[PDB]
């Protein structure tokens, strides 16, 4: 009954990103000069889209990116930025602020692979995914409550959106449109949840290696959700991937 677009953007570069140090929930660094530039370029790229809703993590690097994107936007000045701590980066505990290479050493020393390993004080992959699941539940409820004017009884075929390599791909006739600004590990985990764990459609020519790749700073992804209410429970009946980790603006 409600169809809405979700655009997902990773925050712009920090000095930690540049120096390849792990950045989680505890070190609240700002954008570097490079990050400010990347955020402005993403803001210019998305400037002609109306974001009816905006959600950002509580972390400064993400808040700044969201602020720059909205400042550059030509349609969304009345949209409030909602801070949601559920969008924070995966926690890395004692590994945070150490070279990403140190995490690999810790994994090795502990006998597990980089994928199985969670450092002390850190979050496991399932814990991060649970946060995204909670975010989705909150997102659906908020979109549904606010966009009664957009609700429709008309069902469609799971055919492909128009993807022309432009900023509005897949959203040309989708007026309800949320922006989500978050973090690389969180987004990667979230994308895999959407694609693998849920019923999901992916367009012609999109390689799975791309779908599951790490997101660059200000890399942009897009999904279209169709949600239904049954027994007062909201559920996604269709999730359509449009593009993943796009960085044409860079
Ligand atoms: K699936």
UniProtKB/Swiss-Prot annotation:
GO cellular component, one term: mitochondrion
Keyword DNA-binding: no
Compartment list: Cytoplasm; Nucleus; Mitochondrion
InterPro entries reported for this sequence: His_Pase_superF_clade-1, His_PPase_superfam, PG/BPGM_mutase_AS, Phosphoglycerate_Mutase
Catalytic activity, as annotated: beta-D-fructose 2,6-bisphosphate + H2O = beta-D-fructose 6-phosphate + phosphate
EC number(s) recorded for this UniProt protein: 3.1.3.46
Site, as annotated: Transition state stabilizer: 183
Active site: 11 (tele-phosphohistidine intermediate), 89 (proton donor/acceptor)
UniProt cross-references to Pfam families, sorted A to Z: His_Phos_1 (PF00300)
Main location: cytoplasm
Any GO molecular function: catalytic activity
Keywords: Apoptosis, Autophagy, Cytoplasm, Hydrolase, Mitochondrion, Nucleus
Entry-linked Gene3D superfamilies: Phosphoglycerate mutase-like (3.40.50.1240)
Disulphide connectivity of cysteines: none
Record keyword Transmembrane present: no
GO BP annotation list: apoptotic process; autophagy; negative regulation of glycolytic process; regulation of pentose-phosphate shunt
First-level EC class: hydrolase
Family the UniProt entry places it in: Belongs to the phosphoglycerate mutase family.
Role, per record: Fructose-bisphosphatase hydrolyzing fructose-2,6-bisphosphate as well as fructose-1,6-bisphosphate. Acts as a negative regulator of glycolysis by lowering intracellular levels of fructose-2,6-bisphosphate in a p53/TP53-dependent manner, resulting in the pentose phosphate pathway (PPP) activation and NADPH production. Contributes to the generation of reduced glutathione to cause a decrease in intracellular reactive oxygen species (ROS) content, correlating with its ability to protect cells from oxidative or metabolic stress-induced cell death. May play a role in mitophagy inhibition.
Protein name per its UniProtKB record: Fructose-2,6-bisphosphatase TIGAR B
Protein species of origin: Danio rerio (Zebrafish)
Taxonomic lineage: Eukaryota, Metazoa, Chordata, Craniata, Vertebrata
Gene designation: tigarb
């Amino acid at each position: 009954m409600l169809t809405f677009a979700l655009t997902i953007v990773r925050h712009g570069e920090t000095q930690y990103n540049r120096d390849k140090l792990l950045q989680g929930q505890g070190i609240d660094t700002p954008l570097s000069d490079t990050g400010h530039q990347q955020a402005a370029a993403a803001g210019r790229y998305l400037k002609d889209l109306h974001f009816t809703n905006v959600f950002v993590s509580n972390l400064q690097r993400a808040i700044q990116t969201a602020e720059i994107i909205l400042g550059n936007n030509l349609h969304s000045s009345a949209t409030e930025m909602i801070l949601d701590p559920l969008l924070r980066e995966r926690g890395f505990g004692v590994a945070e602020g150490r070279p990403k290479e140190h995490l690999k050493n810790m994994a090795n020393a502990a006998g597990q692979s980089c994928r199985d390993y969670t450092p002390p004080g850190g979050e496991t992959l399932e814990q991060v995914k649970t946060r995204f699941k909670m975010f989705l539940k909150s997102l659906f409820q908020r979109m549904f409550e606010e966009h009664g004017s957009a609700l429709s009884s008309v069902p469609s075929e799971a055919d492909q959106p128009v993807i022309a390599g432009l900023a509005d791909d897949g959203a040309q006739n989708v007026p309800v449109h949320a922006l989500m600004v978050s973090h690389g590990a969180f987004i990667r985990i979230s994308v895999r949840h959407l694609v693998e764990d849920l019923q999901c459609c992916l367009p012609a020519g999109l390689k799975m290696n791309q779908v599951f790749s790490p997101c660059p700073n200000t890399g942009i992804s897009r999904f279209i959700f169709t949600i239904h209410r049954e027994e007062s429970v909201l559920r996604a009946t269709r999730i359509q991937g449009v593009f993943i980790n796009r960085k044409d603006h860079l």
